[PDB]
Amino acid sequence: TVYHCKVFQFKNLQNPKIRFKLKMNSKELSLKGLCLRIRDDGPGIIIVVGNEKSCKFYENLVMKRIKWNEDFELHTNTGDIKMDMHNNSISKTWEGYLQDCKFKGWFMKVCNDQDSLLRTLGQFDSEHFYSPV
RNA sequence: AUCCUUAUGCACGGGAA
RNA sequence: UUCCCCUGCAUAAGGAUGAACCGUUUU
């Protein structure tokens, strides 16, 4: 059993509407994998492992349907904040086939440094999908 | 998960024998 | 007690298609 796989990378993920869309669409499509980023305000990586149709649909999702370029408003304990998303982007670094994924479920972490991010990818032998910095 | 159509069961109202 | 009509609830069959402020996971 081999599974389709895609790998993406984003400059910023702070918009909760997105992060919601990401998690929900991962579980609803039975995609395995993960989504990481270095610190809340950081850039990171998405990996989706699944059947073709799910991965193509999710690709269409992240690429075509979600507009990461548009600014938003972060509701806060203190009051709204004008959140600048004009300098955001998402691209696909990989796609192909994987013999077996040590990926169990799907989750969305936030790593301290880049090293922690690597190691986290190193649990699942995927560090090789990260184009650092 | 939502809409519509068909079939069945239960409850209420109106009319006939 | 039977028949006819309207409204509400549950089950089954068939056809068509969306949203959702949320982080190691609550198919």
Numbering used by the authors: 335 to 467
Article passage:
Except for an N-terminal region, Prp3 is highly conserved from yeast to human and contains a C-terminal domain of unknown function (DUF1115; PFAM ID PF06544). Our results indicate how Prp3 functionally bridges U4/U6 and U5 in the tri-snRNP by Prp3-RNA interactions on one side and Prp3-protein interactions on the other.
To elucidate the molecular mechanism underlying U4/U6 di-snRNA binding by yPrp3CTF, we determined its crystal structure in complex with yU4/U6stem II+10nt at 3.25 Å resolution. Residues 335–468 of yPrp3CTF and all nts (G81-U90) of the yU6 3′-overhang were well ordered in the two complexes contained in an asymmetric unit. The yU6 3′-overhang can be divided into three sections, between which its backbone changes directions on the surface of yPrp3CTF. Nts G81-A83 (section 1) stack on the terminal U80U6-A1U4 base pair of stem II and run diagonally from the N-terminus of helix α2 to the N-terminus of helix α1; nts C84-G86 (section 2) are positioned perpendicular across the N-terminal end of helix α1; nts U87-U90 (section 3) run along the exposed edge of strand β5 and the C-terminus of helix α1.
